[PDB]
Write a protein that binds this DNA or RNA. Structure first.
Ligand SMILES: C[S@@+](CC[C@H](N)C(=O)[O-])C[C@H]1O[C@@H](n2cnc3c(N)ncnc32)[C@H](O)[C@@H]1O
Lengths: 261, 126, 34, 238
DNA sequence: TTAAAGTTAAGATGTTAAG
DNA sequence: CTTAACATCTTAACTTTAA
């Protein structure tokens, strides 16, 4: 309110704690395994024995969706020269949830936990603020800065989707464990809540911001402490992400798989 | 189709006896107490007939012929307090009274309460 | 004690039978003293 | 200390006079016709669903409204820590196995409409399997985010992550394209307070009534907290 | 009285020994 | 197979304390 403390700013206090690190330039911690097509790329040939799989896949909700459908998940190959004791972190929806978990349990991974992101629209925030009353600002600079509109009732601020059911405001990330025998998994858990509110953009909700992806990455990193860099991840890193982009993916201790056009 | 008569029909058909009334109306007296501590009219009539059937004062043998369940002695005494109309039960020991004279001296107790000019929620104090 | 049964989370009958059992405790204590 | 417990006994007498008058007033206003918070159109049933006779419910619902249920809600008693968890949440009611929850007939109670099954983290796949084999098709999810008394996320203990959410899964059964079942309504996220032990928010009933106005609703595993209008509700401690 | 820290009870956790 | 016991947490309400 007056001292700049509302419902919105009380739930958006984590944003100032996390700041994106610079691009590593050591040629010791980023692995460039760029191939033409992942479904046409033979996996488990350069990597090995990873413990955190990230699949940043844009799901094909319908025919008009410009993403990758579940048939590209059917053709995925995961074996013992790949994630064996680890955890998959894959973006999931509601329409294809049953098929996603059913086809993942056909590979050995079973569901363990949920971690979603409550979408708060910056456009709705500024529109509500200007209705109550802070102009000439598109939500892009509101994302890039911390100058957020005040809001004590946040249930009005959520994004307006176009679902033919209960409206959609959800970015659930599915976690799937790959229990193995005679190899315990070292975890440092309970360090992060399954829900954090994050600010999104209107008519473009299919992406998390730099700070939100940082939150997810640090969540994975503190969850599994032996997969990040302790003097031994020389080439054979214990964390790998699939699909990627030139935005936030090259990480110290992370194999990055790209998708050539 | 209205939902009032619909609700009365559903309650009259498949709801419990302590939830719906005789015409299907909602028994609201049951829903502001606990679960299992409601005072049913059947329990009321059982207490009324057990007052005459057995001795008074001691409620152990009254609880014997009671529902043999959620029939604690203190609640039986506390509801007989209003049944007969006074709080002093200890001075009424050994007195067997039926329902007609129970209503008679209940009316008498409420009457002497309104003459003594300190009546408090239709209960005469002593 | 006396203040441990006066809770706002306690229904009136439960409170009242607590005080009745508590009178039973005082009655037995006076019987013990006498 | 004879005088001490004598004065205690006098205080006991005064307090019991106070409480006797309080309950006498309560009984007098009960007999006078005081109404409770339960709406007059609610249909409560209090019996164990294992021993319930769903044939009678089927016959009555068919013969009265000329239609079957169009929404079923479910808050199953999953198997968790019973009464002394010693680290986390107590779950102060009986627990039902997955076989027992699966046994009861739900596909008979519906032809066209929705289901609402609230799953916990340990029983997410189990709930998906139940509502996939009952004839329903997984369509939607409603998540309850728990805020606290001053309006921030209320975090609760977990294993992999701290748990501050609750999950509900929604599968349709048959034809939806009719006059009922309005589309593009409500939100899947309910941000609301922690108003009791496993007490889901009242906004789920508001969202249900937004989904289909003045419909025929069923709700298994009920308590007196909701007992809403035009709702048939089966419970154990109702 | 006063606000300012200690202390405690509450939250629908997943995994493993003990019969 | 089932109950009991494990940490590796956060937050609000209650309690004590210096001012
Ligand atoms: C999850 S709790 C109900 C919570 C409720 N939906 C709420 O919003 O607070 C499960 C309830 O189901 C009922 N129940 C438990 N075991 C049952 C059984 N075996 N048969 C029938 N009902 C049962 C009890 O009333 C219990 O409180």
């Amino acid at each position: 309110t007056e001292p700049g403390e509302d419902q919105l700013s009380l739930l958006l206090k984590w944003r100032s704690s996390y700041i994106p690190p610079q691009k590593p330039t050591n040629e010791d911690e980023y692995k460039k395994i760029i191939c033409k097509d992942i479904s046409s790329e033979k996996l488990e040939q350069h990597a090995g024995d990873v413990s955190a799989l990230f699949i940043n896949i844009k799901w094909k909700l319908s025919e008009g969706q410009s993403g990758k459908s579940i048939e590209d998940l059917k053709k995925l190959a995961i074996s013992d020269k790949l994630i064996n004791n680890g955890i998959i972190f894959i973006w999931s929806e509601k329409e294809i949830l049953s098929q996603i978990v059913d086809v993942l349990e056909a590979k050995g991974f079973n569901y363990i936990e949920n971690f979603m992101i409550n979408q708060l629209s910056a456009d709705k925030a500024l529109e509500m603020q200007r209705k109550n009353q802070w102009s000439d600002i598109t939500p892009e600079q509101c994302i890039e800065q911390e100058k957020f509109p005040p809001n004590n009732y946040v249930q009005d601020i959520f994004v307006n989707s176009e679902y033919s059911f209960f409206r959609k405001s959800k970015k659930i990330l599915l976690m799937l464990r790959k229990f193995n025998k005679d190899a315990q998994l070292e975890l440092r858990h309970q360090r992060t809540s399954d829900i954090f509110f994050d600010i999104f953009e209107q008519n473009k909700p299919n992406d998390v911001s730099k700070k939100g992806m940082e939150f997810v990455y640090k969540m994975i990193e503190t969850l599994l402490p032996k997969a990040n860099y302790s003097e031994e991840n020389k080439g054979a890193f214990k964390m790998m992400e699939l699909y990627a982009d030139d935005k936030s993916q090259p990480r110290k201790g992370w194999i990055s798989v790209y998708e050539q056009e | 189709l209205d939902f009032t008569q619909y609700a009365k029909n559903m309650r009259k058909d498949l709801s419990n006896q302590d939830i719906c009334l005789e015409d299907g109306a909602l028994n609201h007296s049951y829903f502001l107490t606990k679960k299992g501590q409601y005072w049913t009219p059947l329990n009321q009539k059982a207490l009324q007939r057990g007052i005459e059937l057995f001795g008074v004062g001691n409620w152990k043998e009254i609880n014997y012929d009671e529902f043999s369940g959620k029939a604690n002695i203190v609640e039986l005494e506390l509801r007989t307090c209003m049944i007969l109309g006074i709080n002093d039960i200890t001075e009424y020991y050994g007195k067997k009274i039926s329902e007609e004279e129970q209503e008679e001296i209940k009316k008498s107790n409420i009457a002497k309460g309104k003459k003594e000019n300190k009546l408090k929620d239709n209960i005469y104090q002593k | 004690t006396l203040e441990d049964i006066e809770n706002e989370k306690f229904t009136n009958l439960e409170i009242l039978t607590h005080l009745y059992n508590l009178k039973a405790e005082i009655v037995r204590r006076l019987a013990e003293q006498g | 200390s004879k005088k001490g417990l004598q004065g205690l006994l006098q205080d006991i007498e005064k307090r019991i006079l106070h409480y006797k008058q309080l309950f006498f007033k309560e009984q007098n206003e009960i007999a006078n016709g005081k109404r409770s918070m339960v709406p007059d159109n609610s249909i409560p049933i209090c019996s164990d669903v294992t021993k319930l006779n769903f044939q009678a419910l089927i016959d009555a619902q068919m013969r009265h409204a000329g239609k079957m249920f169009d929404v079923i809600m479910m808050d199953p008693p999953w198997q968790l820590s019973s009464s002394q968890p010693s680290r986390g949440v107590a779950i102060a009611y009986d627990s039902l196995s997955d076989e027992k929850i699966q046994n009861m007939p739900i596909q008979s109670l519906q032809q066209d409409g929705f289901i609402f099954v609230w799953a916990i983290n340990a029983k997410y796949r189990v709930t998906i399997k139940m509502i996939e084999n009952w004839g329903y098709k997984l369509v939607d999810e409603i998540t309850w985010v728990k805020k606290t008394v001053n309006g921030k996320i209320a975090k609760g203990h977990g294993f992999y992550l701290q748990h501050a959410k609750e999950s509900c899964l929604i599968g349709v059964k048959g034809d939806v394209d009719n006059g009922r079942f309005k589309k593009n309504i409500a939100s899947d996220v309910i941000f609301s307070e922690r108003r009791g032990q496993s007490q889901k928010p009242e906004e789920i009933y508001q969202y249900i009534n937004q989904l289909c106005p003045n419909g025929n609703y069923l709700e298994i595993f009920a308590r007196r907290n909701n007992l809403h209008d035009n709702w048939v509700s089966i419970g154990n401690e109702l």
